[PDB]
């Protein structure tokens, strides 16, 4: 079953979707999904919706919200910063924990690109109550990625405008200042539960090498990678998408359902 | 006021968003918005969401649903045809008509790309009860767009797969067969109320010349085109989407609010 849900906090309203298994009523495992930069809760070629329905089938529920300033949620994109999305995330996890259908023992996190960076930080911040973590092409190098564009053109354009057009989105000065001061690798360092990284070798938004760094610097043996040969950033093909979803569902099955 | 809404018919659930102007009294004008091919109700850089909020501020309400097979709604893309989206649209119109807050005499349609083809056909079908029509990069040439693509490669792939992968979506043989049978130009002919066409000269998905054909063939002097120079398909810049939205709202303001 699928229903729209809301969260209202600090005069901000977040809008999202909630899934629960049909044939398994009771208290269930839940996966929270965080979308990427300029993405939304449906995500690229509806891959998050597909993921929710795949989890539903094996008895795991999920929620996925639009961050403030994105998609269906309140706010202008120019009001959003990484930190503001981090705050959204905490409010989202709280929402999940308070559902009478939520098994508070078996809660997992999933994030794509910048949403993957959110997930890593949230997972660690709550390491004692997040049972598993899946990272899709995690943009742990986001601050660096953004800082480079700043020196290339953003800095110059922002100096003059206070923002930059990144394609029908007003990216504000406050975003670049906020994220320049953050290090995602470090804020994710220290999560001990199971971790799945899924990444396409041919990713051109978040280079595949970023996942090497994460395995090395951030997690130990608890982290495993699923490499998808030739795949682009959001796994933009039926078989790339199928692989990413099945591996992630299998992983969440083993980690959230058993014992 | 923004709230999630739901339609069900023939075992299909459509999920959408509804906007109403805050505490204006009694029934209000409504704009129904149809998203494009592989798009969803949020649409490119949230332009539909932005269009909805801009309409709300001038006292015009709106609804935006995901077509069956897309976004948050039920179904896989493989089940969708142009005709099934037409049927969705008829159910969405009915839904809007039967809301207590709807002024039945002031309903307008807006459609992007293939959603524009939908709106054009629906506008004609209900020409006596659709007050105004707005078309964004209307893909009235969708049949030949696909048929070109079909004869090139689809046949062999279709036979053994039943679909082709258009990038994380199953485009079915049924879609191709169904669309070949339609003439959106002829099906849209005869809508005699006001029409606004907004189209970018650098549209790489629906070539600007299609709008020429539509003005020449489909409508009379009741149709007007706003040309956005250099813009791509979904007006992917701050200035372009602003112009598309504002011209569209002004048009709807003029057509829906007084006469
Ligand atoms: C390789 C992927 C990027 C990796 C690095 C981080 C990028 C973060 C944001 C990038 C948006 C880049 C494209 C921005 C395009 C803006 C176009 C625009 O402003 O208007 C449209 C057109 O240029 C007429 O004006
Ligand atoms: Cl929604």
Residue numbers in the entry:
A (entry chain B), B (entry chain A): 1 to 259
What do the paper's sentences say?
Lipases are enzymes that reversibly catalyze the hydrolysis and synthesis of a large variety of glycerol esters. A minimal lid domain comprising the residues 141-183 is inserted between strand β6 and helix αE on top of the CD active-site area. Different from most other lipases, in which the lid is generally formed by a bundle of α-helices, in Tth MAG lipase this domain is compact. It is formed by two small α-helices, followed by a β-hairpin and an additional α-helix, referred to as α-helix/β-hairpin/α-helix (HBH).
In the active site of both Tth MAG lipase structures, with and without PMSF, we observed literally identical density of a glycerol molecule, presenting one of the two final products of esterase/lipase catalysis.
